[PDB]
Amino acid sequence: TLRFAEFEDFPETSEPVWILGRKYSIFTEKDEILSDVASRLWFTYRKNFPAIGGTGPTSDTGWGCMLRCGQMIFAQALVCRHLGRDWRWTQRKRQPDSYFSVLNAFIDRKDSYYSIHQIAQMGVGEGKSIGQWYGPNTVAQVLKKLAVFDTWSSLAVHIAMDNTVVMEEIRRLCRTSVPCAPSPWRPLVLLIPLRLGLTDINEAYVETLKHCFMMPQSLGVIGGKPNSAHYFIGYVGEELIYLDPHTTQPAVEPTDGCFIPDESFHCQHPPCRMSIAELDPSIAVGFFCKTEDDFNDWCQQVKKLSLLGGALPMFELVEQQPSHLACPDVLNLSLDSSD
């Protein structure tokens, strides 16, 4: 569907452009905006990769789109983990060796940690047949189990259910050792599944949703919408900015040596935008906290959200929870009359 989408440049207004925790002016920082979007690892449908499980699909066209959005949000976490948020991709420059290793982790082969092969197979353990629809929560759960194998990145993945982030649980997950007076904290990928409305996002949530893209830790949001999943990376005005997986590219021939031809993993078309009002209410918001200090900063930023006209918080932060019978499976809404 991306192939026949309409693309607009459609700046040039005073409204700040926010991409993954960084603020830009369309008037003066247009190139920096476009560089930042193009630098993100983009994952689309692929064809002619090795058959999944020997006998299954050789392409994910028409079924893989939430899996691709899951790949993009997790790739961005790996980019921050290994390369840093300041890293940018440029043609005609040599990228760090860690860049090709991150990219290597998503190529369409069973020996890559987060290949479509590994995601689809792991999804079976989640009750989902190869070809079935994944919501944000199932894709998040799959990425957690997949990351266990990735000793290179050594990430902690926490999926915060019940609209609650429990700080003691995060420390339990991330602390590798008792803290002194790499490393002592497993870099954290925090994913928070949410349901923000009945068929539409409740507009009380809108300002809280925007601020989620405004944190240094922001990984963006994955969301959809059967067969129309997007990776939202930011916003301008009343529109989200997103990366879209809906185009089928030839699989890239796996890596003999360090170098991988990487042009097709970088979105160079005008960035997609849609009204926040068009957004399906089932989402997962991500944050990356590389050190405990980042996590503490993120916690402070969440507390400051509990004020102003709206927020209107979509999740709560608590030090500890009386956990002797609870859930998942639980998401919460939060419906007015007559929703």
Please report the number of helical segments. 8
Number of strands: 13
Helix content: 25-40%
Shape: globular
Helix and strand sequence:
EEHEHHHHEEHEHEEEEEEHE
Distance between the termini: 31 Å
Radius of gyration: 19 Å
For the biggest sheet, the summary is: 9 strands, mixed
- Structural class from helices and strands? alpha+beta
**Domain unit count:** 1
| Strand composition percent | 15-25%
Description:
The structure is a monomer. This protein is 25% helix and 18% strand. It is built from 8 helices and 13 strands. Strands 1, 2, 4, 6, 7, 8, 9, 11 and 12 form a 9-stranded mixed beta sheet that branches.
How would you describe this structure in keywords?
alpha+beta, 8 helices, 339 residues, 9-stranded mixed beta sheet, globular
